[PDB]
């Protein structure tokens, strides 16, 4: 059972009624536009209505590098390289302008965010805009792509070697010396993962959401 990340609210003091009504609007949109299951690293093609484009319809293909936001405003970022130029578009899931979301290739990566692909080689961000979709067998585990990219020479957009980022899909051996790896460890926080009070347990929250989702499908 896959629950979309936007349905799970962030920790806060917001009244649960606000989330419940906001979820109702999301569900009524999902029965008009089908939102398929995807993760960060999947290849998606999104068709949207652009008032100025030729044919009033625009299609963009790219790799989902980040999913963030909650509620109707949830967004995902698709990155691709077109004619040697890196282009990123931050689509909105529940925007009525979106006509169709197609999962060309459903897969997961070693990291929850692929923002470092900007500093990686252009080959890891270049995908064919006319690639045929990959058939996914039913009742099968989502494939995890353990590919590790090669980074461009420093400086980078962000200090990806820092422990707080917790990046596992970068060939740090090929681009960073041992001294730089040791220097980056000065920011490590071993106590952070053992801080029990900072844990966010959403197992009971997700249970209630699924009951709401199942109830909506019946009616």
């Amino acid at each position: 059972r896959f629950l979309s990340p936007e349905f799970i609210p962030r920790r806060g003091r917001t009244d649960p009624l606000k989330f419940q009504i906001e979820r109702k609007d999301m569900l009524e949109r999902r029965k008009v536009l089908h939102i398929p299951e995807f993760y960060v690293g999947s290849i998606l093609r999104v068709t949207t209505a652009d008032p100025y484009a030729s044919g009033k319809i625009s299609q963009f293909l790219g790799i989902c590098i980040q999913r963030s936001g909650r509620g109707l405003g949830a967004t995902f970022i698709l990155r691709n390289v077109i004619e040697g130029q890196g282009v990123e578009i931050c689509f909105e899931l529940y925007n009525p302008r979106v006509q169709e979301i197609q999962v060309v290739k459903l897969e997961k990566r070693l990291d929850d965010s692929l923002l470092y692909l900007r500093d990686a080689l252009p080959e890891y961000s270049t995908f064919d805009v006319n690639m045929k979709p990959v058939v996914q067998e039913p009742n099968q585990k989502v494939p995890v792509n353990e590919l590790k990219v090669k980074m461009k020479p420093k400086p980078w957009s962000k200090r990806w070697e820092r422990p707080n980022f917790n990046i596992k899909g970068i060939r740090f051996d090929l681009c960073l010396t041992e001294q730089q790896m040791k220097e980056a460890q000065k920011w490590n926080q071993p106590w952070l993962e053992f801080d029990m009070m900072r844990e966010y347990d959403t197992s009971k929250i997700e249970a209630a959401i699924w009951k709401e989702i199942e109830a909506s499908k019946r009616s």
Binding site: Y52, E83, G84, Q85, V87, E88
Partner: protein, 115 residues
């Protein structure tokens, strides 16, 4: 996104914008009252020691949703009347520039790719 002293990349095939030079093209003025340039805003470039107006067709700064974001700051050299200096634009440009066909009709006429 693009302001004074900002280095830009010319994406048209004009000789001025592609000739090698010891200084990269640099924005010296933005024709906006707030001094911050966005897509569709004209700026003045000090390129090859000369002052040439350019049209911003992409920048690294995030903008509104459903709009493309580029990894480089892209401009197209244009004349004072708005006629582009170059003849072909291979680099894709946002489709949002088509709302300005009244003044950028010739700039969009040489654009091969829209993203």
């Amino acid at each position: 996104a693009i302001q004074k002293m900002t280095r830009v990349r010319v994406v048209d095939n004009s000789a001025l914008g592609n000739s090698p030079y010891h200084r990269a093209p640099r924005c010296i003025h933005v024709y906006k009252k707030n001094g911050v340039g966005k897509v569709g805003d004209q700026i003045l470039l000090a390129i090859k020691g000369q002052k040439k107006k350019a049209l911003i067709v992409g920048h690294c700064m995030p903008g509104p949703r459903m709009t493309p974001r580029f990894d480089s700051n892209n401009v197209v050299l244009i004349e004072d009347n708005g006629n582009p200096v170059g003849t072909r634009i291979k680099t894709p440009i946002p489709t949002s520039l088509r709302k300005r066909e009244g003044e950028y009709s010739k700039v969009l006429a040489i654009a091969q790719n829209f993203v």
